Amino acid sequence: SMSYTWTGALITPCAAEETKLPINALSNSLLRHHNLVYATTSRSASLRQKKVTFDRLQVLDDHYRDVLKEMKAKASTVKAKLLSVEEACKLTPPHSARSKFGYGAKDVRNLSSKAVNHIRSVWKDLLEDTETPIDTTIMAKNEVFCVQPEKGGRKPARLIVFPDLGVRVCEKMALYDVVSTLPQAVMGSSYGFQYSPGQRVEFLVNAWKAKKCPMGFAYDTRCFDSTVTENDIRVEESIYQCCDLAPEARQAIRSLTERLYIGGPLTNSKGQNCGYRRCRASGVLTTSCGNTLTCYLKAAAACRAAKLQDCTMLVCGDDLVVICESAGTQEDEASLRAFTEAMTRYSAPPGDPPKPEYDLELITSCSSNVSVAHDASGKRVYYLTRDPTTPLARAAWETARHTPVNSWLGNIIMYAPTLWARMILMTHFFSILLAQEQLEKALDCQIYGACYSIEPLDLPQIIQRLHGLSAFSLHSYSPGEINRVASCLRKLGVPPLRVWRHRARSVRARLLSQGGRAATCGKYLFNWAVRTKLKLTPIPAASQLDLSSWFVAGYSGGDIYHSL
Numbered sequence: 001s002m003s004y005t006w007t008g009a010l011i012t013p014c015a016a017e018e019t020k021l022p023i024n025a026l027s028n029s030l031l032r033h034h035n036l037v038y039a040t041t042s043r044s045a046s047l048r049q050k051k052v053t054f055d056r057l058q059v060l061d062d063h064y065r066d067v068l069k070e071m072k073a074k075a076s077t078v079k080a081k082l083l084s085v086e087e088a089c090k091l092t093p094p095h096s097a098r099s100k101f102g103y104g105a106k107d108v109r110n111l112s113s114k115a116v117n118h119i120r121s122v123w124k125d126l127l128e129d130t131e132t133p134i135d136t137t138i139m140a141k142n143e144v145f146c147v148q149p150e151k152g153g154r155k156p157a158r159l160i161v162f163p164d165l166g167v168r169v170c171e172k173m174a175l176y177d178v179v180s181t182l183p184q185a186v187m188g189s190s191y192g193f194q195y196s197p198g199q200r201v202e203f204l205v206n207a208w209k210a211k212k213c214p215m216g217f218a219y220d221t222r223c224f225d226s227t228v229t230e231n232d233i234r235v236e237e238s239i240y241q242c243c244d245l246a247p248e249a250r251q252a253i254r255s256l257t258e259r260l261y262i263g264g265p266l267t268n269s270k271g272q273n274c275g276y277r278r279c280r281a282s283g284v285l286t287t288s289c290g291n292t293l294t295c296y297l298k299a300a301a302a303c304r305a306a307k308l309q310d311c312t313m314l315v316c317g318d319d320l321v322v323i324c325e326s327a328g329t330q331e332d333e334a335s336l337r338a339f340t341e342a343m344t345r346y347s348a349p350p351g352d353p354p355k356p357e358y359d360l361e362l363i364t365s366c367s368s369n370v371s372v373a374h375d376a377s378g379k380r381v382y383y384l385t386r387d388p389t390t391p392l393a394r395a396a397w398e399t400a401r402h403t404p405v406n407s408w409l410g411n412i413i414m415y416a417p418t419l420w421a422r423m424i425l426m427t428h429f430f431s432i433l434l435a436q437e438q439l440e441k442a443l444d445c446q447i448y449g450a451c452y453s454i455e456p457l458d459l460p461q462i463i464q465r466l467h468g469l470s471a472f473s474l475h476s477y478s479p480g481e482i483n484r485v486a487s488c489l490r491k492l493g494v495p496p497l498r499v500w501r502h503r504a505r506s507v508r509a510r511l512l513s514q515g516g517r518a519a520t521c522g523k524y525l526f527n528w529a530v531r532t533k534l535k536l537t538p539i540p541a542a543s544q545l546d547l548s549s550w551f552v553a554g555y556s557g558g559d560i561y562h563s564l
């Protein structure tokens with residue numbers, strides 16, 4: 001069937017969409033080539049509709065059936081509870097899209113009778129009706145990028161498909177406990193999202209180095225959500241039903257699957273019927289968990305079909321990395337073609353064909369790669385990095401324009417050990433927060449696609465927990481990493497190292513003088529900037545942070561909230 005059918009009505013905006021970086025001194029102190037920065041709009045939505053629209057001709061085999069049987073047996077070792085209306089309400093982000101029925105995210109979060117009574121009636125409707133398609137809104141995402149006139153044209157906007165706020169709260173009541181516990185039980189060490197960034201890089205290095213002769217590859221499916229079939233979504237539901245669940249949860253999961261997850265009508269911001277979806281909705285609670293289970297199921301079966309030796313997989317939704325024992329260069333090339341053919345039959349063809357890699361640092365997945373540096377004690381440290389262009393372009397945009405859910409803070413958290421996050425992002429944003437007396441103001445940001453409320457003052461403790469103490473003292477960055485950052489500085493017109501060092505020395509002196517958490521920021525984050533370095537020891541308060549509920553993936557809806 002077609003992933004989408006369209007009526008011809010347009011995907012419309014709900015507000016004015018800015019496309020350019022405004023004239024701003026604080027943003028210009030970050031990058032001067034402002035004309036290179038753009039934001040996508042609904043005007044390019046038809047280019048994205050074309051890319052995501054295609055027929056799926058899925059064929060399953062014994063390898064797929066065998067893997068599915070193993071996954072179902074492991075899902076039967078899970079027990080999940082229904083969340084109460086109150087518990088699901090508190091998981092709703094403060095800027096979550098308002099309901100069409102006269103209440104918003106604030107009303108849901110503060111348990112207003114109007115919001116709570118509406119959610120309870122949406123719940124009873126899911127129990128009583130297991131067939132009627134649930135409405136969804138289709139919107140074009142406005143995201144910021146830097147122009148790249150090598151691969152020509154600017155990026156078209158991404159699309160987001162989501163049901164009403166009332167339905168979203170119900171999805172949490174039925175499935176939040178499932179999506180946050182089931183993948184670890186079914187896929188064990190292969191479940192990518194459960195690892196912190198520091199644990200992820202350590203796992204990757206140890207999985208790689210444990211092989212006699214390693215070969216690895218990233219497998220990037222072209223338009224994963226569109227490749228997901230009605231049968232894939234019903235198989236995902238059969239896995240959920242293997243859990244030990246309450247009767248109402250079983251009924252609500254069956255109803256959400258048939259009415260929402262398998263497909264439904266698409267409505268624009270104007271209330272016009274845009275078409276029909278027969279694939280994964282990008283903005284549903286199960287998007288991340290469903291994509292992970294489906295991608296794992298297809299990949300594990302394709303590993304068997306390809307006869308890859310000692311397949312070790314890391315799965316984060318649609319992002320897949322396979323590490324195996326090499327059988328020789330020609331044999332590995334043949335095995336990869338067989339893997340791709342198997343994935344293609346299962347309705348997961350690649351964007352670009354995978355290439356076998358024999359150097360861990362040359363694999364890219366989730367836009368990231370493993371790089372190496374040394375710490376204050378001279379110890380070799382592996383860490384994850386990425387090209388800094390998109391993070392810096394977004395950082396300049398978010399400096400000049402208010403953004404309710406920022407990217408710079410999540411980027412500092414996820415990429416804390418990196419040369420670019422340390423030299424630029426931390427220096428720039430601590431300078432502004434200090435000057436504006438906003439160090440204590442908690443900000444909404446995203447980590448693994450879910451929303452977090454974080455106070456910038458807690459960054460040293462968060463960084464220590466997620467990356468380790470070494471994150472505050474890395475030196476001897478690789479030449480490849482130095483070049484990638486220097487190229488970005490040249491391209492975007494960012495000030496050089498000497499300028500960031502001067503700014504960081506000034507920021508550090510002011511933070512230290514404030515004492516308390518601000519002094520920890522100055523001491524740890526900016527120890528690189530001073531000649532006479534302070535001794536960095538484990539921060540006692542770091543173990544106080546409750547991170548037990550962290551790392552539940554929210555892509556692409558981002559409709560999960562946690563306050564630190």
Ligand SMILES: CNC(=O)c1c(-c2ccc(F)cc2)oc2cc(N(CCO)S(C)(=O)=O)c(C3CC3)cc12
Nearest residue numbers: 192197314316319320321363365366368369384414
């Ligand atoms: C299957 N792919 C993966 O597991 C990931 C790889 C990867 C794996 C193998 C390899 F050879 C090179 C890179 O790098 C990552 C970076 C992030 N992060 C950034 C998310 O934007 S992070 C640095 O916070 O950990 C995440 C976050 C989404 C969970 C996942 C991955």
Ligand SMILES: C[C@@H](O)C[C@H]1OC[C@@H](C2CCCCC2)N(c2cc(C#CC(C)(C)C)sc2C(=O)O)C1=O
Nearest residue numbers: 419422423474475476477482485486497501528529
């Ligand atoms: C403060 C400085 O004069 C001293 C010293 O601090 C330690 C590190 C850095 C600093 C910035 C913040 C993170 C640690 N460092 C560094 C900077 C690099 C670079 C670059 C380009 C892209 C600008 C050309 S390469 C590198 C390394 O150690 O290999 C330094 O040179």
